[PDB]
Amino acid sequence: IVGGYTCGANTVPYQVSLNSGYHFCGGSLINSQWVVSAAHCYKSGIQVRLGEDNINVVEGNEQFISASKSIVHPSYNSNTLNNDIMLIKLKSAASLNSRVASISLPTSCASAGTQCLISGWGNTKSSGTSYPDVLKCLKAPILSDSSCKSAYPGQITSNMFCAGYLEGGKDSCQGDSGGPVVCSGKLQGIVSWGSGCAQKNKPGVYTKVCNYVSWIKQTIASN
Ligand SMILES: [Ca+2]
């Protein structure tokens, strides 16, 4: 996260870190046994870490659970990042409490102007490299489809929205990928892509979760 603030320990209780010997992606807990992330975050050997603040220090609220199965969206296209969404099932259920909690799926899509919270352990600089140990937070609005498409001509599908600031300076970044965009208590987005980080006229692009609720719910019910 560039230009954000220190969230505070366990103030974002649905936030997960995906670990393959090191943090490599974010995710969201959507029930006791399932996590949602980006498809471009796919790898084999994933451990899910819940209850994290400092990802380098065991502080006492953590749950570390292996993934049993990963499911990349059937129509994921790694060239265009269309359908950039993946489900991860945990080997056993997490224990849910005030500090580890699931986030609700939307019943309807959010519109431009809604304010949202974006969170993660990704890079904090736009020019150069500095990875935080503690979770960072950013309040950002959803942008119009028209400003989104104007920023990235020929690149935005119906499964994508932009959020952020056209003036630059505040954005998600490398290492935030797969993490949550939550708006009015519902998961509306997944951190997906962008050109650089926090560049002017280049906002963040997010997977539009409300398009995938049917797939998520049917997939969970059958697996
Ligand atoms: Ca920790």
CA neighbours closer than 13 Å in the CB half-sphere of residue 159: 19
Ligand 1 centre distance from Cα of residue 56 (Å): 6
Sequence-ordered list of residues with C-beta below 8 angstroms from that of 218, at least 6 positions apart, any chain = none
Q: Is 176 annotated as a binding residue?
A: no
Q: How was this structure determined?
A: X-ray
CATH of domain 1-12+103-210: 2.40.10.10
Question: 12 — alpha (psi -120 to 50), left (phi > 0) or beta?
Answer: beta
3-state SS, one letter per residue, for the chain: CECCEECCCCCCCCEEEEECCCEEEEEEEEECCEEEECHHHCCCCCEEEECCCCCCCCCCCCEEEEEEEEEECCCCECCCCECCCEEEEECCCCCCCCCCCCCECCCCCCCCCCEEEEEECCCCCCCCCCCCCCCEEEEEEECCHHHHHHHCCCCCCCCEEEECCCCCCCECCCCCCCCEEEECCEEEEEEEECCCCCCCCCCEEEEEHHHHHHHHHHHHHHC
Q: Do domains 1-12+103-210 and 13-102+211-223 have the same CATH topology?
A: yes
126 is catalytic: no
Task: Clarify whether 84 is annotated catalytic.
Answer: yes
User: How many CB atoms within 10 Å of residue 78?
Assistant: 11
Question: Is 174 annotated as a binding-site member?
Answer: yes
Listed in sequence order, the residues at least 6 apart from 191 whose beta carbon sits closer than 8 Å to its beta carbon are 26, 38, 118, 120, 122, 172, 176, 177, 178, 179, 180, 181, 204, 206
Instruction: Return the structure tokens found at 157.
Output: 């599908």
Q: Classify 13-102+211-223 by CATH class.
A: mainly beta
**C-alpha angle 203/71/87, rounded to 5°?**
55
Does the annotation flag 172 for ligand binding? yes
CA distance 65 to 194: 30
> What does the domain layout of the chain look like in residue ranges?
1-12+103-210, 13-102+211-223
User: At a CB cut-off of 8 Å and minimum separation 6, what does 115 contact?
Assistant: 139, 140, 141, 183
53 given a catalytic annotation? no
List the resolution, Å.
1.5
* Of 211, 90, 221, residue with least CA distance to 158: 211
